[PDB]
Amino acid sequence: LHKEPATLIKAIDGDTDKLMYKGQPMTFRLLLVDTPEFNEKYGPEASAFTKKMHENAKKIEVEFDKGQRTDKYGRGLAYIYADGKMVNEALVRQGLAKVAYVYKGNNTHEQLLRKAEAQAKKEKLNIWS
Numbered sequence: 001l002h003k004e005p006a007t008l009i010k011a012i013d014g015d016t017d018k019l020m021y022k023g024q025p026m027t028f029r030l031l032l033v034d035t036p037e038f039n040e041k042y043g044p045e046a047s048a049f050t051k052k053m054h055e056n057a058k059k060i061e062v063e064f065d066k067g068q069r070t071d072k073y074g075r076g077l078a079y080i081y082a083d084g085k086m087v088n089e090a091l092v093r094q095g096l097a098k099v100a101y102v103y104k105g106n107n108t109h110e111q112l113l114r115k116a117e118a119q120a121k122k123e124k125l126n127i128w129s
């Protein structure tokens with residue numbers, strides 16, 4: 001897999017953003033994770049966390065997996081990195097997202113995120129509290 005450039009257009013919520021990619025505005029849905037919706041518990045904390053990670057980033061990058069790059073809603077499916085740090089993993093590691101939506105062929109970083117989830121759970125963090 002490889003990282004490609006993008007620039008923030010807008011934070012949206014825990015697991016979606018709006019980025020400029022190849023010069024076009026797109027909504028991205030983070031691979032392999034599920035944040036609570038804003039109206040749910042930890043939803044606001046998840047949005048804030050993702051927002052901050054995106055907004056404080058000097059450098060945003062997009063990393064597609066091997067499979068479909070867009071979902072049925074037209075959202076890009078990617079791992080997103082803020083200054084080299086994966087947002088998808090960071091959310092899980094903090095217990096602000098669950099590993100979810102693991103579809104065969106876009107699951108390269110499954111075991112990395114599951115390891116983060118086990119640690120967040122051990123620490124009884126947020127969703128696991």
Ligand SMILES: Cc1cn([C@H]2C[C@H](OP(=O)(O)O)[C@@H](COP(=O)(O)O)O2)c(=O)[nH]c1=O
Nearest residue numbers: 029030031032033034071072077101103106
């Ligand atoms: C993460 C992800 C979600 N989706 C779709 C499945 C779900 O369909 P449904 O909308 O029919 O439930 C939905 C969950 O996204 P959200 O968690 O953003 O709602 O997005 C994919 O198709 N591929 C993916 O890799």
Ligand SMILES: [Ca+2]
Nearest residue numbers: 034035036037
């Ligand atoms: Ca969600």
